Subunit: 114 residues, 4 copies
């Protein structure tokens, strides 16, 4: 099944933050309405934040997270969780190798903000 | 029901990161085996990261997140989500006022690391 | 924080199913747009299904699950999880006593159907 | 990533329930420690319960849900959610065709029981 794709309410500010846990340099791309809106790149094996930014879901509300290492797309796992019917978390994990820890690049999208 | 308390596998490294979305200064305290292990403090209405750190769950695996503003405990909401039976997210939202956006202090705990 | 309240897409068919795990008779009430739409009642300590039904979210999309034992409201815990940005689960747990297993009445709402 | 596999605490009673939403007959197989423990079969396009049963996670705690239609494995989506660090839900969705509603066979595993 497709992973890393989330439908957010339209024209809503949301945060996107990425963490790295791999020897390989992680390239995290965030698309809004199928067009790039943010790109983070970094390397860490200690969960360092390689990027964080505030974006707007726009008219479509479509947000997609892509993760690659040296140009090769990583396998993604994702889900959205909503607490008290208000607080949203769109979560993404990714695997660039063979150990299957799926934390090589971890991306957290949260809203509402402010 | 109690919120903000999570049982992680023993002696496991995990990451904890906090974001702020409120006029009030957020004080996030993380306890491991009922003893403080990390404290983040900051203010932002734009989802700024007020802290991030790598901790160890220790022998008990008990991790508890506390959030307060000017010494008054905020109301918490939380849940744990596991993807592909490997990637874990312990999520916490908090409300310090009356608008109920529960994002005043948002805390994300993730594991495994590395 | 409020629990047991979910905003579903408008005019959408959804399923609601309740399980019981308590000595007390569980009364599960489901409200759509603040008006009762379904009521299940039963007793079991072996997770028996005390009710299942197909409802429509209607114009408001507001769905609220209430659980009580002998007229006393139980304490609720809840969350919504979305898989592959399509499959939705609105989950509710409830505690009628002191052991805090929160399974006395477990309610699962799922959509889409068909 | 692998889906439909969950690690439950050892020797713990859990419930497993399946719903159907497809023209095709759904065959849901539940394995405990890689050995079949339950099999449900049924057809419905109205979310009918095609099976529910109480099982024990056993010594390994390994539980895997498989779904097939006419012998062809369906594509699975899954996740585990824990509320108030006590109530567990292992969720599975499946797609047997091309519309991607992933509800053709929906499986819910919950614990603790009693
Ligand atoms: O070379 C990449 C890789 O093996 O790096 C070490 C660990 O972070 C792994 O999970 C990751 O797949
Ligand atoms: O004064 C605190 C408060 O009102 O600040 C503005 C918003 O972030 C609110 O959600 C928050 O409760
Ligand atoms: O008398 C009610 C109660 O104690 O019944 C036995 C168990 O199911 C408990 O969790 C429940 O709170
Ligand atoms: O023939 C199988 C199928 O098309 O049946 C009707 C709907 O339930 C669909 O989602 C399902 O994939
Ligand atoms: Ca890896
Ligand atoms: Ca890794
Ligand atoms: Ca607030
Ligand atoms: Ca706020
Ligand atoms: Ca109880
Ligand atoms: Ca009980
Ligand atoms: Ca289908
Ligand atoms: Ca279907």
């Amino acid at each position: 099944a497709t992973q890393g794709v989330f439908t957010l309410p339209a024209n809503t500010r949301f945060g996107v933050t990425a963490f790295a846990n791999s020897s390989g340099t992680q390239t995290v791309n965030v698309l809004v309405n199928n067009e790039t809106a943010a790109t983070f790149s970094g390397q860490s094996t200690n969960n360092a934040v390689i990027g964080t930014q505030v974006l707007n879901s726009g008219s479509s509300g479509k947000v997609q997270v892509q993760v690659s290492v040296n140009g090769r797309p990583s396998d993604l796992v994702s889900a959205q969780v909503i607490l008290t019917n208000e607080l949203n978390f769109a979560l993404v994990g990714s695997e660039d190798g063979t150990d299957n820890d799926y934390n090589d690049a971890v991306v957290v999208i949260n809203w509402p903000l402010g």
